[PDB]
Design an enzyme around this catalytic site. Sequence first.
Site, PDB file in Angstrom:
ATOM      1  N   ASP A  87      -3.557   8.926   7.184  1.00  0.00           N
ATOM      2  CA  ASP A  87      -3.227   8.611   5.768  1.00  0.00           C
ATOM      3  C   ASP A  87      -4.122   9.475   4.894  1.00  0.00           C
ATOM      4  O   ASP A  87      -5.363   9.405   5.009  1.00  0.00           O
ATOM      5  CB  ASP A  87      -3.465   7.132   5.457  1.00  0.00           C
ATOM      6  N   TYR A  99      -5.388  -2.699   6.015  1.00  0.00           N
ATOM      7  CA  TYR A  99      -4.612  -1.494   6.288  1.00  0.00           C
ATOM      8  C   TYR A  99      -5.591  -0.283   6.306  1.00  0.00           C
ATOM      9  O   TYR A  99      -5.553   0.558   7.216  1.00  0.00           O
ATOM     10  CB  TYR A  99      -3.505  -1.278   5.231  1.00  0.00           C
ATOM     11  N   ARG A 122      12.976   6.417   9.408  1.00  0.00           N
ATOM     12  CA  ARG A 122      12.008   7.101   8.539  1.00  0.00           C
ATOM     13  C   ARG A 122      11.189   8.186   9.249  1.00  0.00           C
ATOM     14  O   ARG A 122      11.778   9.094   9.856  1.00  0.00           O
ATOM     15  CB  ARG A 122      11.148   6.081   7.784  1.00  0.00           C
TER      16      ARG A 122
END
Lengths: 248, 247, 248, 238
Positions: free
Chosen positions: B140, B153, B13
């Site tokens: 993120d 997370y 990935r």
Amino acid sequence: EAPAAVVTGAAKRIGRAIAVKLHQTGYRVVIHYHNSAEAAVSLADELNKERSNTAVVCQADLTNSNVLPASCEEIINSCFRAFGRCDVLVNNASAFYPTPLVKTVETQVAELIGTNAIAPFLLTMSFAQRQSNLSIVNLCDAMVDQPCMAFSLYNMGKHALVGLTQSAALELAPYGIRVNGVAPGVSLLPVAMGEEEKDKWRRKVPLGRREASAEQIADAVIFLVSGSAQYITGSIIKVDGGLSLVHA
Amino acid sequence: EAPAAVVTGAAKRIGRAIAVKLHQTGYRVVIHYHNSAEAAVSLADELNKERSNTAVVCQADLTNSNVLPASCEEIINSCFRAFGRCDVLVNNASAFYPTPLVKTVETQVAELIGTNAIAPFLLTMSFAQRQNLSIVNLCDAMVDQPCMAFSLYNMGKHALVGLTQSAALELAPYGIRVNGVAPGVSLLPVAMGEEEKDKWRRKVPLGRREASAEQIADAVIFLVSGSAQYITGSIIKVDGGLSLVHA
Amino acid sequence: EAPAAVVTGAAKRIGRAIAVKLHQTGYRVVIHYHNSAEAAVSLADELNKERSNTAVVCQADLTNSNVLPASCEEIINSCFRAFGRCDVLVNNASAFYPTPLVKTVETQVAELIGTNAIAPFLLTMSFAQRQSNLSIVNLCDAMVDQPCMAFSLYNMGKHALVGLTQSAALELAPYGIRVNGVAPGVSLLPVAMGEEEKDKWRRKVPLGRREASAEQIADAVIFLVSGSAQYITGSIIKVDGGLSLVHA
Amino acid sequence: EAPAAVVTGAAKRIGRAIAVKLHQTGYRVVIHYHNSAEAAVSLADELNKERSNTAVVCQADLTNSNVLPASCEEIINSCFRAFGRCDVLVNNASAFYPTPLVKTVETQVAELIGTNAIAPFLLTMSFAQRQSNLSIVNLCDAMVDQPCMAFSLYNMGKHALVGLTQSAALELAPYGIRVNGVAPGVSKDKWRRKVPLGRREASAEQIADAVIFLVSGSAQYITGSIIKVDGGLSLVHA
Ligand SMILES: NC(=O)c1ccc[n+]([C@@H]2O[C@H](COP(=O)([O-])OP(=O)(O)OC[C@H]3O[C@@H](n4cnc5c(N)ncnc54)[C@H](OP(=O)(O)O)[C@@H]3O)[C@@H](O)[C@H]2O)c1
Ligand SMILES: NC(=O)c1ccc[n+]([C@@H]2O[C@H](COP(=O)([O-])OP(=O)(O)OC[C@H]3O[C@@H](n4cnc5c(N)ncnc54)[C@H](OP(=O)(O)O)[C@@H]3O)[C@@H](O)[C@H]2O)c1
Ligand SMILES: NC(=O)c1ccc[n+]([C@@H]2O[C@H](COP(=O)([O-])OP(=O)(O)OC[C@H]3O[C@@H](n4cnc5c(N)ncnc54)[C@H](OP(=O)(O)O)[C@@H]3O)[C@@H](O)[C@H]2O)c1
Ligand SMILES: NC(=O)c1ccc[n+]([C@@H]2O[C@H](COP(=O)([O-])OP(=O)(O)OC[C@H]3O[C@@H](n4cnc5c(N)ncnc54)[C@H](OP(=O)(O)O)[C@@H]3O)[C@@H](O)[C@H]2O)c1
Ligand SMILES: O=C1C[C@H](c2cccc(O)c2)Oc2ccc(O)cc21
Ligand SMILES: O=C1C[C@H](c2cccc(O)c2)Oc2ccc(O)cc21
Ligand SMILES: O=C1C[C@H](c2cccc(O)c2)Oc2ccc(O)cc21
Ligand SMILES: O=C1C[C@H](c2cccc(O)c2)Oc2ccc(O)cc21
């Protein structure tokens, strides 16, 4: 078949470095200027000698007024008249000076909000309406949240420009136009600034204790317009050698 | 003479695409993996077929434990043993799963906080101690609008933002730049039904599609390049405007 | 009939001022402490003199470990044991010290990430599971994006605490539990710090050239727990006299 | 003796709730209005019936123009004329409407940027120039970074207002004037369903509550801060 870009305030300093770099990457360029006629035409000459018919100049006062929309419409039209296309807009022109809270105030508003925010909004409108890898890059300010004292109107203009960057990225995404920003910390210091003042600022920068070169700013613009930033929209890249991370 | 880079979680990935593009750019690479041995080895073979002796694998679990510091030191050491230098660290490896407020919770803490934040910190320490040097952390773009029930997370990715900033500041005197790349929706889980992938794809303003791994890699390539020599402490969103979209 | 609150690290300094002001407001209080046993008991005595049976102490180490979930469970349990309810959790306890990138490192991680982030998450879990105007207040840091150099692990814990504040506000809103933060700039400075270094910091603060009192911090906590904040969740209120606005 | 506050756009909705709450706390108020004369007066009558000579009205258009600085100076002047002091400025007045990128555009500029940012700046200047618990509160927008589609000029004005908030908090801190914001989310059912906190809008009174906190002595160390009052809405991903 070469794409074309408009860079506002491109006669000198960071705007010139961005127009030079876009031209080195193969763009045809509109060099917008306001007062710096000799420096603009000089630059256009230098680029045109490198490849004929690849640079034109375009004069416009980007102060807010009832004719600012037509002036912005005309800058974009100049790109389409010279080159048949307008692939990239770099909103680089900026007025920068103190407006202490304690020129008429209304002229200060028009220049500082006009050049930094309203003209980018109108240019963005005109660029979108006149429409491949289309994008806009706004020259922002990495220190927007830790502003210079007595610079409220300039700071308000640059915040509004962050707003525009995010709003226009959202709205123009479905038309395939990306909108991003580049936020210098200290780069080319003011021509009027004395060396001792320059060095005070230089000393605050974690990465190498020096200001960004104009080329270092332009590099981030070039990335943002390139095929390597095809999924990037609504991003503002700081190019500040860490200056915005440094506490009081 | 060729520089060298460590990419954590590089078997598959996004990490794989980063490793490939670093390799294509001229870097020798340490492909770190945890469980994906056959994929990490296949990547190293593919890279070495392109240019002999330019890719090695390094296995390590990046869960927090009292052995994590030694694991992270070993990863950096492997780059120096293999290549004689370590120019770039990419903190890419990540655990990602929900931890609702209402595996033991301490294992969840060790995995989600360890992979996303502690291991990047320990790797960053080991990288700096051993010294165009730079570190790229995979952050993120949705950190401030997080997925429901993803608190650990989200805490690990917030901590990684703090690390990116703190390490940019502290390492700038050594000429080590520290930046992040913050995906929005990039490669989706393999098992996720297309109809669910499409729910997310439709939210993305730019093209109504997720980022490819290569598009994430492209921002990493920029950040490690001579074109970003003055960029430190910056986090570039690569999210097609997803984070600008209100509920 | 009187609501009850847990305050972590409440024996001294800011957490003590929070506990006091909550108690003055009508709350029964669990005074959590780690090492400051005499201070904790002395506080609970003072509050109980004022309204009998309104204060207990609860000892615990908030360092990360495999028994941390039990300790945090026990803190919440102590509030239910003493008072039959638990209306407010204040996550105030904090380790703070440098961890240069260039005690073992795993102890530094356990302390700086445990106290500042993991124990808050576990306390939040326990609070929510054991369940009006319920709310949680996390003590954050207004300087999180302009960190003290060499404080990476501390700064990481506090960034995690911001993430927690937002994630928990989102997830617990359906249960009527609001989750907010209060972010001091410079408040009560370290006991250990020299008077010269304390004045260096005080001089940087725009509003008054002084540190926040502990009571000024508690005042924002009191607002966020009160009925005047019922629609506020996921917000972090800076209480730093403008310090985070000041450039390097 | 009693402190005095100016609230712009105070005739209706959030600004009214704000004036009412400040009045209930013991302030004298200037109820600024543009078009809502009847409402501004009705509010003024209700407050003076409660306590005589504690509420005045002031008409001004807050559109940017060559006369806006005079208008803003006059608003502050009105506070000093009526009450002998001006302790609190609440910049609440706002224009709100879409301006698609794809009224002349410059009238849009004058209204969206003028009322939302330039008037707040000129009012701040006048407030500061005319000067023991002094503060300004700007009504911001919790969704500033996740804006409504095709609301660019509105969004620009609200971003500028964040900049004003931060710049003025820095510049006026030496004068002991604190400068803060309150950022509502939604204060129709489609929107309310997205709100984590009880799937309802903020009442105007919940907005006023945050203003009341920020002007109070419980906030004497708070400057440059913007308090979201949005029920969590800004935390909700798409
Ligand atoms: N330099 C830094 O360190 C720094 C720091 C933070 C942000 N920035 C941002 O980075 C960008 C480039 O910086 P810079 O220093 O190169 O810019 P600058 O030299 O201050 O200004 C660039 C050009 O803006 C044009 N301009 C000014 N007022 C104008 C008006 N009323 N109408 C039309 N054009 C006008 C001028 O063109 P003419 O010369 O033709 O009159 C000027 O040459 C700017 O957007 C700036 O705000 C720079
Ligand atoms: N995909 C997205 O849309 C997205 C969105 C936001 C952020 N990101 C971030 O972008 C980065 C790359 O994303 P991705 O989707 O490609 O990552 P991914 O596939 O979820 O995970 C990357 C690799 O992390 C390694 N890893 C997981 N747990 C580990 C542990 N305990 N110890 C050591 N290594 C471990 C795994 O290696 P093995 O396979 O070798 O076990 C895995 O292949 C990550 O940091 C992720 O958080 C991704
Ligand atoms: N003071 C400031 O200027 C400032 C600035 C930014 C943020 N903050 C934050 O505001 C909050 C209060 O500040 P403060 O200065 O009052 O904090 P502090 O005095 O530095 O710490 C508060 C208490 O935390 C407890 N604590 C430390 N390590 C612990 C452990 N392993 N387990 C359990 N408890 C532990 C200690 O309790 P015992 O004494 O019982 O051992 C200590 O008295 C903190 O979250 C701090 O991070 C403060
Ligand atoms: N309601 C929400 O959900 C929400 C959300 C985000 C932000 N906000 C912010 O919160 C504050 C108050 O919200 P609201 O909904 O109560 O505001 P609003 O009803 O949209 O407008 C408030 C007042 O602003 C005045 N105003 C508008 N244009 C003007 C002009 N050209 N000159 C002078 N005054 C003008 C009007 O006064 P007259 O009636 O006297 O003409 C109006 O009653 C505003 O700053 C708004 O931007 C509200
Ligand atoms: O020349 C400067 C430096 C100046 C500057 C000077 C010193 C510190 C700092 O952070 C920024 O910022 C500018 C902003 C807009 C502009 O058009 C020009 C400049
Ligand atoms: O597979 C995903 C997608 C997932 C995701 C899925 C859907 C929307 C969105 O913003 C993000 O984000 C991840 C974050 C870390 C990671 O290691 C993997 C993923
Ligand atoms: O004692 C302090 C002040 C200290 C401090 C010192 C100097 C500047 C500044 O912004 C903050 O920050 C702390 C953070 C956590 C904590 O538990 C205590 C302190
Ligand atoms: O009445 C509204 C709601 C409107 C609104 C409506 C729906 C979603 C949302 O975030 C905001 O926001 C406003 C902004 C300025 C203003 O003067 C009034 C409003």
